[PDB]
Structures are given as structure tokens and as C-alpha cells.
């Protein structure tokens, strides 16, 4: 009896985990620059998963060899009572890569780790990864970068959300954060319980696609528009509507 | 006074054109199976969108050269009475390519051709790419190819809709057609006037990822799952409400 409006199922104990992998500084030897406002996008996320009964778990300018433990930790604990999972990546990173401290991981490996076969109690449960990463370029300044990073599409019931596609450029204020991270965690404020959660992300595309990219107090900044996407698995309808205490 | 409802404008004189290029037998020296089953995906399609208000425009079999030029048309006619753009790729594909009979063309120049710069009358309607493609492997059989083509995004407006992602399997029944499109073709014909299109599209990525492959005529072919996904970079709800004459 195949329902049109069928949603995930959000009714478990805890609404799940929501991992934020942050990166402000890298080692000298990559010549990759400062991320300045990346906290403010780690700060603005934390608090807007919060709200929506996330355990929010944060970690700072990690190396390769931590990033990996701590990822493969959490994917090999049981997330029978959850309803989803959350990751974040707030780098740098090029094509199927991310930038940890020290070096660069397949971003594959990472959504591996939480692939059907390989993490039981995920199974038919949305996995999100929301990726702020672009090419590193070199009081609140607008800083811009290419994107780099290939949109690419995981698994069933992965939901993967870029900041920027190819062509377009992301930016980035030294204190307020990405335009991208802002308007997610308004829409997150405004719309995160009510809304399903590719309606949101749509709003997060007009919001950033409408931000005016021809008077910009640097010259060469001019005409660099900016457009997130996603990419889908999900097979059902998204919410993250307050759950009973 | 921002709307999080907001729906994309679909009250035109016309819905707009469909394009569809079907691709069933390759130049000799490209050495590309025969595709046998698409004709069922291009008349499926055709009678679908037909019911949804396109002007389908159907091409079987062009070279390089042809579909450039009917492509290129479509582009610089005017789509300003129009609600929207479909253009529908049923080939073989690799990486940013797919095949025409001749050749292998570079997907970003098609949809690029349809960017807000080099298209005015389609700036702020949606432009959906709907890419059955994979990798040629050299009475109603299930022919299994590997996923090949890119899950790109294409820019502003654009809806890029993919039957298979990495690491997964694309199925064409040699009478029936690709899994992909009959699920594609069943969710337009039950839902495609009433539900939000990415909705739809979700809806189709339950159908194909529920799709069983553990008791197949092929030993070979157990345990190669289909997974599609969308990439969306629209800004607004999608709906295909009947047309008031
Ligand atoms: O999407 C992009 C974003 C960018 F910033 C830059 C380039 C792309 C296009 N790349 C891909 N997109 C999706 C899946 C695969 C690729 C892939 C893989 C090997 S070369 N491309």
C-alpha cells in the first residue's frame, strides 16, 4: 500500500549525532590560507543542531590520523535509538578530497563509513553531510574562493549539501562566516521543525543565489555569483519536528 | 516579505519543450553495445510529459554534429511564454560526457548552453536534466551496467536528474526500459500534476533502491544495486498543475 507522502521516521529516543569537523589553520607546508570565520560557522551550526536535538560534537584543526579515528569511532557505535546522523566539513578541500590539518582524505571513505553494509543501525536512516569547502586562494572582510569540490552523490538515504558548484565561487566574511553557513542556520532558526528538509535547502539556494555580487568593495570579486546545491538519495519525505519529551 | 512556499511561476501560455536524444546503436569503431529497450524509455517519456503540457521533440540516433545544432536551436529560440526547459539524454556515458552516435560531447556545454548569460527568456524557470547513461559493456532480458557519468550539478534553476550514482548499477529490460524510466514514467503518470517534481523524484529513488537483485537469471548480476539520485540548484517549489485553456 505505497504512500507518496511517506516520512523518515523521527520517533527514536535521541534524534542522533551531528559530527562538525572545523578547520581555521593548516600545516605550513600545504601553503593553505586561514579560514578567519569558520568558528562563527561552526558556532551558528552547533547551536541551530542543538535546537533540533543534535548531541552537537565539535572538533578543531584535527590531522588526518584523528579525523579518521574519531569518524570511524562514531560509526561503530550503535545508532539503533537515533533517527539520523549529521557531518560537517568547514575546510579547504579539491575534487573528492577534504583537507584535514596535515593532509587530504577521500571524502568516499568518510560516507563509506556509514554505508548499509557497513553501519547496521543506520540502515533506511537519513545520513546528511553539509560540505564549506573550496580552493585555497592566497576588519570583516568578504573573502572569495573558487569551488573545488566535486558535488558528488554517496549512497541511499545520504543526502549530500555543498555550499558552491562548479563554476561559482564561495565567500566567505572574516567574522560573520560563509554566506552559505549563515543562510542555512537562519532557514535552520526560522523553518529547521517545520519544514521538509530539502524545502529548506531550496530556500538556502534562493537565499545565497540572491546575494548582489556587482558592488563589492573589492574590484576583482565583481560578477562571482554564488550557487549551492544538493545532491539527493533520500527515499522519503525529511522532518526534524520537536520531539516528545 | 520572503515566502518559504514560494513556488516557481507555471502560469505561461506554454509548459515549454522536452527535448529527448535516444541513442540505441553507435558508430561501428566506437565499439558500444546496441541499447535495446531504450525506444520503451524515449516513448514512455515521450507520452508523459506530452500529458504534462511539453511540446516533446524526439531525436533517434544523431551525430555530434546534428544534436549540437537542434540543441543549439532549442537554446536561442525564445522560451519567454514558456514555464520551463526538459531536455532528456538516454546514451551511453563517461565522466562529463555522453555519447552521441559519432562521438562523446561534454554534458557542461549542453546545459550551459541554458545559463541565465547565454538564455534571457528561461532566467528564473526551471531547467531539468533528466541523463540515463552508463558504461557500454562489449526474449525481455535485464541488461546491468555500471554507473559512469558524473552527478553534476549545471548552475542557477537547473534540476539535473540521474538514473544510477558511483559505485552503483544501472538495469534496462531489453522490452520494458530502463528501471530508472519506467519508475520515472509510473510516479509522472500517478503524481506528476499534483506532487512537488523533487518530491516525484524522490518517490522514484524509493522505487529503484527498493528494486530486489538477489534472485536474478544471472548470477553475475546479484547484489548490483540501483541508487539515482537528483542534484537540484532550484530555488523555489516545482509543480506541473494542469494548464487552465
Ligand atoms: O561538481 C563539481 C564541482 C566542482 F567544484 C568542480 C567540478 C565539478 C564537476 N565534477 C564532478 N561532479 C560530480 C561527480 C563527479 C565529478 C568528477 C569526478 C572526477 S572529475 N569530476
Not at 134 to 140: D, F, K, M, S
Not at 153 to 179: I, K
Not at 210 to 223: E, L, N, T, Y
Amino acid at each position: 500500500m505505497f504512500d507518496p507522502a511517506e516520512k523518515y521516521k523521527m520517533d527514536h529516543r535521541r534524534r542522533g549525532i551531528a559530527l562538525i569537523f572545523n578547520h581555521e589553520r593548516f600545516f605550513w607546508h600545504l601553503t593553505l590560507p586561514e579560514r578567519r570565520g569558520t568558528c562563527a560557522d561552526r558556532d551558528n551550526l552547533t547551536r541551530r543542531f542543538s535546537d533540533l536535538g543534535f548531541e552537537v560534537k565539535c572538533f578543531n584543526d584535527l590531522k588526518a590520523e584523528e579525523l579518521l579515528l574519531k569518524i570511524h569511532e562514531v560509526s561503530t557505535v550503535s545508532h539503533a535509538d537515533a533517527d539520523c546522523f549529521v557531518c560537517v566539513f568547514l575546510s579547504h578541500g579539491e575534487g573528492n578530497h577534504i583537507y584535514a590539518y596535515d593532509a587530504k582524505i577521500e571524502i568516499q571513505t568518510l560516507t563509506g563509513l556509514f554505508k548499509g553494509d557497513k553501519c547496521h543501525s543506520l540502515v533506511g536512516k537519513p545520513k546528511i553531510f553539509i560540505i564549506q569547502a573550496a580552493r585555497g586562494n592566497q576588519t570583516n572582510i568578504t573573502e572569495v574562493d573558487a569551488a573545488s569540490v566535486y558535488t558528488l552523490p554517496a549512497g541511499a538515504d545520504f543526502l549530500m549539501c555543498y555550499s558552491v558548484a562548479e563554476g561559482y565561487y564561495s565567500h566567505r566574511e572574516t567574522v560573520n562566516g560563509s554566506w552559505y553557513i549563515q543562510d542555512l542556520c537562519e532557514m535552520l532558526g526560522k523553518y529547521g521543525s517545520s519544514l521538509e528538509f530539502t524545502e529548506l535547502l531550496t530556500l538556502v539556494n534562493r537565499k545565497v543565489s540572491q546575494r548582489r555580487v556587482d558592488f563589492c568593495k573589492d574590484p576583482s570579486a565583481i560578477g562571482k555569483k554564488q550557487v549551492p546545491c544538493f545532491a539527493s538519495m533520500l527515499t522519503k519525505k525529511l522532518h526534524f519536528f520537536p520531539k516528545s519529551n
